[model samples]
Structures are given as C-alpha cells and as structure tokens.
Target: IFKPEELRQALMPTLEALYRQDPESLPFRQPVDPQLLGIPDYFDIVKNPMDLSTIKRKLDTGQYQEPWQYVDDVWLMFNNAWLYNRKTSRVYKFCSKLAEVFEQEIDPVMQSLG
Candidate 1:
C-alpha cells in the first residue's frame, strides 16, 4: 500500500542536489560505497543494475533490497539511485530539507483536503 510518488517526493531535494550539485556522498553502507559507484560515461562505464550478486548476504539485511518482489521496479530504482548519485554526488543536506517542505507546505494542504 505504498505510494511510489511519495518516494519520489521525498527524494525531490535529493533529485535537485543531483542535478544542481555533486552527488559524491552516498550512504556509507555496503552496496553503496562511492568507489563501487562511478560516474557513468553513457558509453563504456555505465549503470550496472545487476552488478551485485543475486545471493542475499549479511550486508543485504536492511536497506539493500532483495529482488524477491518488485524485480523490475527495484532494479530500476537501484539503477536510478546509482546514476543520480554518481553524477551529482548526492548529499543528504539537500533532500532532507525537502522533507520539511513537504510536511509544512505540501502535507498540511493535502491533509486538510482529506
């Protein structure tokens, strides 16, 4: 029962940062190391969606999703994050602010209607 756009909205600031600034900073956890992710060339080096193994390991516990459910969408999201972060060097400060904006400016208006 999750609205996909909510994720998009939550990531709006992140998206802005990706486009406006550098996206070098990413989650320090596994499957998200900066060294592993590189700036895509749109030619040789690119977003490797299925780059990681299919096996479920210890690091794959929390944020790292398993492909048991939304295979296509998950890959798309995974790839999308990598591409966006790799290009703009995503940092939390940018998107975190948008969360507040959504709550104050957007969420309040929507809640009143409902």
Candidate 2:
C-alpha cells in the first residue's frame, strides 16, 4: 500500500523527466490550445503565480482528493489547449507513447491500492 506522499515521491522523477522533456515533443504533454502555452487566461491557473497559494492549499488539504487525479485532469486540459493551437504529428506520437507508458508502468501500481 502507498500513502499519497509515497506515491508522489515515486512519481516525482518521472514527472521531472516529463517536465524536462518539452511538451511539444511529448504527446501526453501536448496542449489542446497551443496559444495557451505563452498566453495567460483566467482558466490558466497553473501559470498564474498569484494563484499558487490557493492551488497549493487545495492540494495540501486533500480537498482535491488525489494528486494523480489532479495531474490527469490538468494534463488533458493543457494538451487539448496545446493541440488547438499547434497540430504536430511528433507531439501526437509523443503523447501516444506517454499514454501507453503511463498505463503500463504507473496505472497498475496506482490501481493496486490506495
């Protein structure tokens, strides 16, 4: 069984790796609205420095439930935003591979227990 912290620790390296890898090159990281990449919108909470505290508080309080749940949702939204702006086959391929890897390497473990 894994607590939230342990699960977070285990995934950190993978997350870091993904971060270092440009989203444009990683399909899973692809944003649906490419314009959202450098632009700031009200819905774009992640890049808003001012909202960091509120976001942090939500995560820390467990009010959001699970971290991965938050991660997955954010990933989808960002990717959708990215895709809307830039349609790149390379990014699509990267996201496809990433989705497979996540399902193969992480989903099982995550689903095994709480």
Candidate 3:
C-alpha cells in the first residue's frame, strides 16, 4: 500500500535542509533527546523486537511477506528523509547500499503492482 514516490515527496524538505547544511533549517531545530524517551533504548541502532526463534518461524512459514512489504515502505521513507536532509547524505549512501542488497535478494520475489 505504501508508495516510494509518496515517501520521497514527504521527505523532500528534510533532504533539502540536509543538503544545505543548515541545522536551524532542519525539521527539528532543537534536539529531541530521544534517549530520554522510553520507546527506544538507543537511538542510533536498529532494534528488531522479534527474537531469533520468532524470525525463523516467520521465515519458515512465509511470513516474510509483511516484513518485505515494510522493507519497501521504510526504505522509501529513509530515502526520502535522507534526500531532504543533505547533512545525512552519508547515511543515505549507507542505506542505499543496504537497499541494493535487499533488492537483489528479495525484490524480484515480491514485486508489487505499483
């Protein structure tokens, strides 16, 4: 249901700010201090709540459909966000590389109508 183009459009402003290197122009002018939030233990790392057993079970049962769907959505979201925040170009490059890997490994198997 998610569209890459839509995500990119949403992140356009952030990408522009990142390119300009003007922190004041960023969407968040002040530090939100994510660490203070209990939602995430660490802000800089990727955390999957599912355990290995759960993951394995999902893979075995072809439950990868949902994750793969989300992968496309999140990737587009990140790509759009990175584009708007030029300061995050480096991060964008990293994500792009990872995306390529995912595309090679899974895109063909889960091609969407869009």
Candidate 4:
C-alpha cells in the first residue's frame, strides 16, 4: 500500500530520463493487467487481496460461471508490479513481469473457460 505509491513517485526520474532520451519509449505504458490487455501469478497481497482458495471453492460450487467473473484481477497485478518495480527499479523488467502473469496464468484459465 505505502510502497506502491512511493515507487510510483520514484518514476519521475525514470520518466524524465526516458523523456530526454526518447519519450516514445513508454515501457510503463505496457498494459500489465490481463483485463486491460483483455486476456492473466506469485502475488501475495498484504491486505484485501483476492481469496483464491475461497474463489476456487466457489468455482467448484459453480459460484463463478460468467466469463467476466473468470476474468483477470488487475488489482493484484498492480500490487505485484508495484512491488516488483520497487525491488528492481527496472521499468522494462516490471512491465515484463506483469505481462508474464497473464501469459503464464490468465491465458490458461481463459483458454479453459473458452
């Protein structure tokens, strides 16, 4: 929660550097969330994250049937990417990790749903 915003502020330097070199390269602009990308991992949320175990139980009981309900949870992605960027301070790396969640996790679930 706290760190997510902090790293966001740190991006000013990266943004400025990127802007000076080439503003066209918007690594951060890459849509990390599966929903945003319209597809999506190890993401532990300290607070208010999804309860996938319960969600799984619900799924087993047929609580979640709609394609929308089965869709990716971008909040977790944002939190995960936020933490990753703080740890690595690598914009491109953060973007890649976010995309990885969708490619590795979301795509399969969506494929099954389809």
The predicted structure with the larger lDDT, 1 or 2, is: 2
Worst 10 residues of 1 by lDDT: 50-59
Q: Candidate 1, which segments miss by more than 4 Å at Cα?
A: 1-38, 41-90
Ten contiguous residues with the weakest lDDT in model 3: 23-32
lDDT of candidate 1 over 11-97, digit per residue (tens): 334333323322322331124334444634432433543212221221133322322232343234345444544434443343343
* Segments in model 2 whose C-alpha atoms lie over 4 Å from true places: 1-4, 13-64, 74-88
Steric collisions counted per model: 6, 20, 10, 2
Q: Estimated TM-score per prediction? A: 0.25, 0.43, 0.31, 0.31
Per-candidate Cα lDDT values, in order, are 0.35, 0.45, 0.39, 0.40
Task: Give me the overall lDDT of model 1.
Answer: 0.35
Q: Which of the numbered candidates is closest to the native, going by highest lDDT?
A: 2
Candidate no. 4 TM-score:
0.31
Model 1: how far residue 101 lies from native, Å: 1.4
Q: Return the candidate ranking by TM-score, descending.
A: 2, 3, 4, 1
lDDT of 4 at 57: 40
Give candidate 3's whole-model lDDT.
Answer: 0.39
Model 4 ranges with Cα > 4 A deviation: 1-47, 73-102, 108-114
Q: Which residue pairs come into collision in candidate 4? A: 40-102, 40-106
Mind giving the per-residue lDDT tens digits that candidate 4 earns over 4-114?
333333322323332233322243343344445332232232333432233334344554435345234333434545554454556436445544543454454445444
Best by TM-score: 2
